Amino acid sequence: TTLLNPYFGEFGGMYVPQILMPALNQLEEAFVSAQKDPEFQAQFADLLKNYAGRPTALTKCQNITAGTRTTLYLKREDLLHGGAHKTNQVLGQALLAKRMGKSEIIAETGAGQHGVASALASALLGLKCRIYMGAKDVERQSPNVFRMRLMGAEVIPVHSGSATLKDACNEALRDWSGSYETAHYMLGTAAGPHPYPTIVREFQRMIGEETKAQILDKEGRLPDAVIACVGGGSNAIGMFADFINDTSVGLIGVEPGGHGIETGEHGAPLKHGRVGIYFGMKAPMMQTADGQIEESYSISAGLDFPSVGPQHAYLNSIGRADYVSITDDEALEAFKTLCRHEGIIPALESSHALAHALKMMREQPEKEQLLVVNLAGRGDKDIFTVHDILKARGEI
Amino acid sequence: MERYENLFAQLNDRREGAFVPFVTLGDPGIEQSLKIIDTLIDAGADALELGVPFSDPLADGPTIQNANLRAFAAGVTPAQCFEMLALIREKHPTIPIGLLMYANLVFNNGIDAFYARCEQVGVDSVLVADVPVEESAPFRQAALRHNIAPIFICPPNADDDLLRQVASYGRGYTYLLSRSGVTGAENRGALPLHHLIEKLKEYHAAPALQGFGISSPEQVSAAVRAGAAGAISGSAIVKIIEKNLASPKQMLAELRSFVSAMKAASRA
Numbered sequence A: 001t002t003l004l005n006p007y008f009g010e011f012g013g014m015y016v017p018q019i020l021m022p023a024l025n026q027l028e029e030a031f032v033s034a035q036k037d038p039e040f041q042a043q044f045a046d047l048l049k050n051y052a053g054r055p056t057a058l059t060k061c062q063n064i065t066a067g068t069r070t071t072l073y074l075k076r077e078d079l080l081h082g083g084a085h086k087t088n089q090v091l092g093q094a095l096l097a098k099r100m101g102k103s104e105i106i107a108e109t110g111a112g113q114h115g116v117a118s119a120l121a122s123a124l125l126g127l128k129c130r131i132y133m134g135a136k137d138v139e140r141q142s143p144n145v146f147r148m149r150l151m152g153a154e155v156i157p158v159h160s161g162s163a164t165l166k167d168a169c170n171e172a173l174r175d176w177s178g179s180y181e182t183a184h185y186m187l188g189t190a191a192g193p194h195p196y197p198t199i200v201r202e203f204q205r206m207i208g209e210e211t212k213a214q215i216l217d218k219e220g221r222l223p224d225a226v227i228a229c230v231g232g233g234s235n236a237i238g239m240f241a242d243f244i245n246d247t248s249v250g251l252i253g254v255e256p257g258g259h260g261i262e263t264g265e266h267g268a269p270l271k272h273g274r275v276g277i278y279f280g281m282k283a284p285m286m287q288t289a290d291g292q293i294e295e296s297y298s299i300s301a302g303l304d305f306p307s308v309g310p311q312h313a314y315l316n317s318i319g320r321a322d323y324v325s326i327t328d329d330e331a332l333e334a335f336k337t338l339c340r341h342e343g344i345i346p347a348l349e350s351s352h353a354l355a356h357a358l359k360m361m362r363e364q365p366e367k368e369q370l371l372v373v374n375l376a377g378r379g380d381k382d383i384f385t386v387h388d389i390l391k392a393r394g395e396i
Numbered sequence B: 001m002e003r004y005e006n007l008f009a010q011l012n013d014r015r016e017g018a019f020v021p022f023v024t025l026g027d028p029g030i031e032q033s034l035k036i037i038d039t040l041i042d043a044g045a046d047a048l049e050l051g052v053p054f055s056d057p058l059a060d061g062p063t064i065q066n067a068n069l070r071a072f073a074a075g076v077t078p079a080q081c082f083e084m085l086a087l088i089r090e091k092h093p094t095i096p097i098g099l100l101m102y103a104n105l106v107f108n109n110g111i112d113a114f115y116a117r118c119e120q121v122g123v124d125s126v127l128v129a130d131v132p133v134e135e136s137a138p139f140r141q142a143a144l145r146h147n148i149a150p151i152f153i154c155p156p157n158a159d160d161d162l163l164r165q166v167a168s169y170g171r172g173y174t175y176l177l178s179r180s181g182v183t184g185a186e187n188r189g190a191l192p193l194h195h196l197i198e199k200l201k202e203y204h205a206a207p208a209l210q211g212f213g214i215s216s217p218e219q220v221s222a223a224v225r226a227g228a229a230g231a232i233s234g235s236a237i238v239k240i241i242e243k244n245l246a247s248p249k250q251m252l253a254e255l256r257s258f259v260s261a262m263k264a265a266s267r268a
Ligand SMILES: Cc1ncc(COP(=O)(O)O)c(/C=N/[C@@H](CO)C(=O)O)c1O
Pocket: A084, A108, A109, A110, A111, A112, A113, A114, A115, A165, A188, A189, A190, A229, A230, A231, A232, A233, A234, A235, A236, A301, A302, A303, A304, A305, A347, A349, A350, A376, A377, A378
C-alpha cells in the first residue's frame, strides 16, 4: 500500500527485501507531506538560492552555431555549488532526512560527484555521512574521495562483486536494511525503488522550470527540444519534467555509446539493453544473457549506472521522449569544441548531450531549431582524462 | 508434491524441529558443492536452502557475498545450478529443496518458465529475496501453477495486515526473520518472536522457520521452544567452507560435526 503509484507504466516498482518496505513507506509519506509544507519549501528554496546559488544562468552559445539556423542555449548547472546538478536534490533529501528525525546519511557514488554532493549537504546540515564507493572507483577517483573526506564524510570502499557503482548501490541498501530507523539513504539518481524516481525528479525539476522561464523571456517561445545526458536519469528528468505537458517540446536523452553500440562496450541500456529487475526496480539493464548484472562503459565516469530510471523507460515507451547515443569520440569532439569556441569546459557526461545537439545542427544546418542542452556539470575534473587521450593520439 | 507438508507432519510426530542449512550452489566448485550437500543431508539436514550465484546479492552479508564470488570464480552458471538441482533430487526423494533467488534470475528468461524448470528438476520452494509481498503476485502465481511453494518473509516488525498476507499467500514454510539487516553469523537476533509465531498459527500460515544469524545449537532449541517449526543456518555453514577451502576432507568433517550438533538441538 502506497500513497503514489510506484510504477510508470510497466517500469519501476519497489523490488526490495521485505525488511526495507517500512523505510520506503516512511520516506514516501514524508515526501508527500513535505511537498505540501510551505516551511519545508521555503527552507529548500533558501538553501538552493543562498547556498547553492540558484537560479543558474541560461547561456546563449553563438560561436558554435554560427552560419546555421540552430540557436543553442546551455542551462548552466555547471555553475551550481559543487559543480554539478547533483547538489539540488541532495539538499532536498537532506531536509527530508531531518523531517523524519534522522541524523545519519548513507549514499552511493560512482564517479564521486554524488558522494561529494552528499558530503557537502551533510556537512552544512549537521548530518553524519557515510558513502559507499566501489574500490575500483575509489582508486580512480582520489580527488573526489579526498573532497568527501575533507567535508567529514566516511568513504567506505566496496570490494564485493565488480567493485564498481552497482556494488556500491548494493552495499548502501545492505546498510540501510539494518539502519533505517536512524539513517536516510540519499540515493543519487532518478532510479531505484519507489519513491526515489519521483522524489529525485521533483527535487531536480527547478532545472526545467527555470529553463522554461528563461527561454520565454529571451526568445518569447518554448524550445524545439531540450537535450540531456542519461546515466541514471536525474539531470535529464530534472530538465524534462516541466516540459512533459508541452507536447511541442522535444525531450531528447543521450545515453553513452562508449566504443560503439555494436562493440557491446557502452552504457545505453534503455535503447540497447534488456529489461530486468535490480536495484529495487523493473527497468532496462546492462546484463548477461543469463541475467547477471553488468557494468556500463563510457569514457565519462559519471555515466556508469548500469540501468536507467523507470520514468525514462516509460516516456520512451509512449513516444513522449526520444533516446539516442553518443560515442566516446563524439563526446570528446564536443568537449574540445565548447572549450575552444565558448570558453566553457563541460563535464564529459554532458559533453554527450552537447555532441548530440551539434549533430542535430550539423546534419541539417538550414533547419530552424531552438535547442537547450542541460550542462549538468563542469569539466575541470576531466582535463586529466582528456589530456591523456590527446597525448596518446599525438594531438599533443 | 507435498514435501514440506510431509516433513513437518513427520517432525510433529517426533516432537522435533527442522534444521535447514543454506549453501551457495557450486561453492567452491560443482563437484565439491555436490559432496557438501550430500554431507549436510547425511549429517541430519531436514531440508535445504540453496542459493543460485548472483552478481548482486543485496540481502546477503560478506560471508555469503564471498560464497557467490567463489562460485563465479569456478564459472558456475544458473544452467549448471539447475543441472545440480536435478541430480540432488535424483539422489534424495523426500527432502524439501528450497531455492534462494534474486528477482532478475527469475524474471530473466520469463517468470513462468523459471518456475516450470524448478518443477521439472524437483524443487519444492522458491524465496525471492528482493520481492516483497507488495510485488509478489506474478511470482507466487507462477510458483503455485508449477507446484512450487512461494516463501514469504515475516519481518520482526510485521503489522497485522502483513501477517495476514504472508499467512494467506505462502506455502511450504513461513520465513521468520530474526532481525533487520542482511545474512550473517556475526549478528544474532535480539527480539522475542513468539508473538509473531502465535499470530502466524492463528492465521493458518505455513509453519515458521527462523532465519538470520542462527549459528549455535542453543539458537535452534530456542526457535523450537518459541513455537517455530525449526531454524535455518547459512553463514555459519558457509564459514566452514571458507575456512577449509584447502582441505576438502577437513571441510566435510567439520560440516558433518556442525550439522549433527545443530540437528541434535532440534530434537525433543
Ligand atoms: C557530472 C555528472 N553528470 C551526469 C551524471 C549522470 O547522472 P544522472 O543521469 O544525471 O543521474 C553524473 C553521475 N554521477 C554519479 C554516477 O557515477 C555519481 O557521481 O555517483 C555526473 O557525475
